[PDB]
Design a binder for these strands. Structure first.
Lengths: 261, 207
RNA sequence: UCGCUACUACCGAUUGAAUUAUUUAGUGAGGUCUCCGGACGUGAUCACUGUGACGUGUUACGGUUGUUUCGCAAAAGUUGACCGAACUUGAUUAUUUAGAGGAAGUAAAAGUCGUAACAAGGUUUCCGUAGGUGAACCUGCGGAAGGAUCAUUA
RNA sequence: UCUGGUGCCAGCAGCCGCGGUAAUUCCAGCUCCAAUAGCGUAUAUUAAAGUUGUUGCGGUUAAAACGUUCGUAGUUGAACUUGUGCUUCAUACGUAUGUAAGCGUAUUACCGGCCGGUACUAUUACUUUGAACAAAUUAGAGUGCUUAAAGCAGGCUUCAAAUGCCUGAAUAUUCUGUGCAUGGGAUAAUGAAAUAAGACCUCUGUUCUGCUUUCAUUGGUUU
RNA sequence: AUUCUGGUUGAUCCUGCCAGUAGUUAUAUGCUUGUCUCAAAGAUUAAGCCAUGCAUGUCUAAGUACACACGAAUUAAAAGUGAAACCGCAAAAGGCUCAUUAUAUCAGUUAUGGUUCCUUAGAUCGUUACUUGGAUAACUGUGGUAAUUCUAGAGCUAAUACAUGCAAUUAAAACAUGAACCUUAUGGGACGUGUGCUUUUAUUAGGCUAAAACCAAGCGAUCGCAAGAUCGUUAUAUUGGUUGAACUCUAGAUAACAUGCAGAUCGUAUGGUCUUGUACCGACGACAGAUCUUUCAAAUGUCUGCCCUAUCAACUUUUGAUGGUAGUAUCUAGGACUACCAUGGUUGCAACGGGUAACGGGGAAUCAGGGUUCGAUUCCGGAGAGGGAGCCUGAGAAACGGCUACCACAUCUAAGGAAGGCAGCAGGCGCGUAAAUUACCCACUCCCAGCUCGGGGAGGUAGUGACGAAAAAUAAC
RNA sequence: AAAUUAGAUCCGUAACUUCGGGAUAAGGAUUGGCUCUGAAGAUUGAGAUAGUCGCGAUUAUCAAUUAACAAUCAAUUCAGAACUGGCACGGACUUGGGGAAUCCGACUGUCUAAUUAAAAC
């Protein structure tokens, strides 16, 4: 507001969780204020020219999205810099692509081509159940899709799968000490499952303990904790192999050293 | 303009903070209302972002509410008797929040015996030597529609002695509860139980 | 010590001089707000006038009319507050600079005068403190050895 | 310790020092040595500096213990408390427990199939591992831009046809401390029970507080 | 790449400094220079002034188009391009600079339940002609002053500009009030009335362990012949809510409130249906709509952390200083401001004052460690546009490539008057030890607009360039 | 010679100094009329609950009052505000000009009645 609100944003000031190069321009994609926040976004100059390499300039992206070929979450989204954060199903039926943006274990995202049958619903967590929207009830989602008239047993800290054609709940996965989860936001990013125990600190900032399939017990805040099903329940397709909590030398030993060529 | 935050205004040790950010708009202040009892003026000021509040210099009427009823009858505002912020605000009859005020006492009394037909507080019986003829056009009982509801009350109809004496004079003590320089109105509640006995001890014992 | 030749920094009448910001009082441009104000420009009624219609009793259409009722906003100008530039004055700082004269310092050995100290430096030295003296210095009182006695004197 | 020139001259020299008609130091010739597309000079700054001293100085005489003692702020402060023993067994080789279990009367009460929900945590400093948070820089992983400083690419099947594949684009110092989570309880302070406003108990009912379940609904008598 | 040598003496051992020594994205300067890859660059002194030039504009089949400027043909559909002009949006970002500023900025942490918000996405939209009113630019026409900048007068005309205005706003249902209803009870009604949201005030519920002893209606039910007497079942302390909570909070009801706001808009298709007859309905977007939830943010506040100085030891409080209290004011807390009380508040653990050749932090230079010095400088944050002050419009500015005045400088003038701020990019003067072209284009990275297409001296790109880094001619057999 | 200043309230006040001063330093602001408002006192405080006898007259009390206890009564002063005119307002009168130094005498005191009041005593 103080002569704001800062329409620009610089390269080497946009995050390197989108893996931008230091040379290549002064500036950075600057997502145009959609459902997801700025540091938790991937603007659609990144996903089309830098990742899929369908383009090679920046001008060859507005010659893609303005023809309504792109389709973020079923709706068209001809915005050339739409934020399109976590689990936003970019369902390109032409030329039959069907991605989903799920985050990699190295702190970053990863391109994950998913099945077209489970592409048309996605999983999203809830934030605040409240009254006032029609008629009395509604809840807000992690991207902010307010959806009315929910189940009265879905409290906060849980997730529901949303169909991409409707806006309606079909299944709820609630926060118990048996449910596998996924972390997005901290140093522990991309690591998947499973919960052990949550330390409730009254006012505020609860943390929770998560045990990976390797026995790798660790912890993070409850803010960063998504939830993706019960014990040994992948309710969505995950990318490359679960985010095992690889060692630092083992990735230098798995494919970097143990390399057929 | 008038400014509202502490660019000036030395610190908690006694020391002079010097300069601090030439002058910014978002910490501005405005000249006050000083809403007198002149009838019917409102200027509206464009405020912080996009909005507008009503600077109601010179009001005369207010939506006053007898709190012990669940009623809110609009009256006019007669006198500004007492005020705890100043006496420059009493004497110039300026209406701000909780000025003790005098209103009408009539649109409550007609509402009173509408639902609580019991006649009190009663005036001088030389006037009351005949009715025109009220006690049957009050209820008439119909044998028997909606109206026996007026006699499982009389448990409500014993309004206190220090309020019914103030109804026979036809002007009652109230209290402002709005922000006339902001809300554009001078509404409020009226003194009943011990807000009354404090603000009335404040007047006649001080004189 | 004194004398010539330089150089720096002090003290100093002038109640000197030039800034620098910070304010007390004073005046004061503008503007926000406010009390009025009401150019012009409508509304609109009061009548109507041009005609027809009814029963001339009444009305329809035209006259940017007559002219009174009733508004609606609104420019100039204004009253009062409030922000306040700005100059004028006073004080307060914080620097810089001119000064007769005065007095210390340094460089400059090669000037004059004497020899203060280091050898028992020819009066052992030094200290504190006072006074005196061309100059180093002298003298009193007290102290110390960094002394020229580590001392032998039941 | 070259050759001519000049003669306390001209000048050179960061400092020490040279030069006064033989100069290894000047000025030139003939050579030589350093670094090399470079190198010299000036100012600042770091190292040198054990000459600023936390690591790490000095104070009898070299610069330096106040003339003396009191003394508040401050800085520092004696020892003392569950320490272990046995019984063991899991575990390096009759020996070695380095994980643990059994006696010092009870290291926190229930149900679940040794195992989970579960009631209960004197304190602070310190310390363990965390969380949490900009990038560039820095540390630096990987990589034949020909190399290099860089760069964040590229590579392969392969000279191919070929959405034809493969993996990148690390991990950290940093943003040192504050603050938070968790383990520890050595070290170091405070804390407690004094003629007991001490503890459990005498669980006595002497005193309590209160209000949602039922007096059909709804009101009174009240345990 | 944890090291030292010369210099006090007739010689000695020391203390000691001086002189050497090397690095410096560290500045200038001296001499010379064959390439080539990257490239810092008016910061220091003068945030001192500045010739000229440019740096902010924008259109979709989709707000408005009467231009023969160009298209066609008696179709209003021209649906073409659309100049202009109106309206909408943006011009508050970027870019430059470092004067101010010493718990202030800033950094981290935590808060906003103390607030506000264009946009963006998501959800949401009943309690008397239904299709309208007038008036202006563009355009035509005649004008003025030294002066182009400026603007008047008249004739035309639009809308998603301005203004009014829903007969289904439509009630049953819900529900007070009466009403043609009329009975020993957890009892019944035609209809007349009324019940948008929002603001304001006021009220009441507000997240919740179990039973009877006894009792009036004796209805459910029982007994007494009965007047009736003893009892008794459940639907009845029936709203999210932080899972830290009288969150005055998002919800709801009650009694009001005043005053506004409320979809008379647009392109592409039209057929279901033809009587081609306003009987019959898609997909889209919008000057726009309103409430709630998000998001790009902001602005305040929390807890810690800053350089030199005591030849600065006590400061603050008349004229707010520390608190209480009621107010005002603001978007909101709050001495922020007012009025009344209270006399507090900071201090040797350095307050207060002064200095600063001080924008803070990331970071930079240099060492074995511990460290010292620097940071005008490309990134985040603050700050400001000659000096101060004021302010309009706007969701956003105390904006200066906006305005208004004063002050200082300058400008034009026919003497009446009119306009100006390069610490944007280039360029000139000046000061200086000290710093380049009055070049080229938006292909890049992104930003903005009505928005595939326009614009952007942001940005990229050549010219100068021994600041600084890298690979290496000046021979070889 | 004359003019200037002058009462009072408030703020502020230098060199020197025998630390008493200087000092009313200097320098500034305020001031009428009219309507209210605030503050500063005193003295009795004020007594709540049978009815004998016929509420009436003979007829009760520890304390708590209290945080304006309530009336009476009393003088006068000081702060505040609003309005208000030819700025005329201490409206007459009463009523200091100030400052930078030099010389002498320290100071207050005394003196040449009738020419010297001083630095003289």
């Amino acid at each position: 507001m103080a002569r704001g609100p800062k329409k620009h944003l610089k390269r080497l000031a946009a995050p390197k969780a989108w893996m931008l190069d230091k040379l290549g321009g002064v500036f950075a994609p600057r997502p145009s204020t959609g459902p997801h926040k700025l540091r938790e976004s991937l603007p659609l100059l990144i996903f089309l020219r830098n990742r899929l390499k369908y383009a090679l300039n920046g001008a060859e992206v507005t010659k893609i999205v303005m023809q309504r070929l792109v389709k973020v979450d079923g709706k068209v989204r001809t915005d050339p810099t739409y934020p399109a954060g976590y689990m936003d199903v970019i369902t390109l039926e032409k030329t039959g692509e069907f991605f989903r943006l799920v985050y990699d274990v190295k702190g970053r995202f990863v391109i994950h081509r998913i099945s077209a049958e489970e592409a048309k619903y996605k999983l999203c967590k809830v934030k605040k159940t409240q009254l006032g929207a029609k008629g009395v009830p509604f809840l807000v989602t992690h991207d902010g899709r307010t959806i009315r008239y929910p189940d009265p047993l879905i409290h906060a800290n849980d997730s529901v799968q949303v169909d991409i054609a409707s806006g309606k709940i079909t299944d709820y996965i609630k926060f118990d000490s048996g449910n596998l989860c996924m972390i997005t936001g901290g140093r522990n990013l991309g690591r998947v499952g499973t919960v052990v125990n949550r330390e409730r600190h009254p006012g505020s900032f609860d943390i929770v303990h998560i045990k990976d399939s390797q026995g790798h017990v660790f912890a993070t805040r409850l803010t960063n904790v998504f939830i993706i099903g019960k014990g040994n329940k992948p309710y969505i397709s995950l990318p490359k192999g679960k985010g095992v909590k690889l060692s630092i030398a083992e990735e230098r030993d798995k494919r970097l050293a143990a390399k057929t060529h | 303009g008038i400014s509202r935050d502490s660019a000036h205004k030395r610190r908690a040790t006694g020391g002079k903070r010097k300069s601090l950010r030439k002058k910014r708009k978002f910490e501005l202040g405005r000249p006050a209302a000083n809403t007198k009892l002149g009838s019917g003026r409102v200027h509206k000021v464009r405020t912080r972002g996009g909005n507008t509040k009503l600077r109601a210099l010179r009001l005369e009427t207010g939506n006053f509410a007898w709190a012990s009823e669940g009623v809110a009858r609009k009256t006019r505002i007669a006198d500004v008797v007492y005020n705890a912020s100043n006496n420059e605000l009493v004497r110039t009859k300026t209406l701000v929040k909780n000025s003790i005020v005098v209103i009408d006492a009539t649109p409550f009394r007609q509402w009173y015996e509408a639902h609580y037909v019991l006649p009190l507080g009663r005036k001088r019986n030389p006037k009351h030597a005949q009715k025109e003829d009220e006690n049957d056009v009050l209820t008439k009982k119909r044998s028997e529609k909606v109206m026996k509801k007026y006699l499982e009350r009389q448990k409500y109809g014993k309004v206190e002695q220090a309020l019914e004496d103030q109804f026979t004079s036809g002007r009652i003590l109230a209290c402002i509860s709005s922000r006339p320089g902001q809300c554009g109105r001078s509404d409020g509640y009226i003194l009943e139980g011990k807000e009354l006995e404090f603000y009335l001890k404040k007047i006649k014992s001080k004189k």
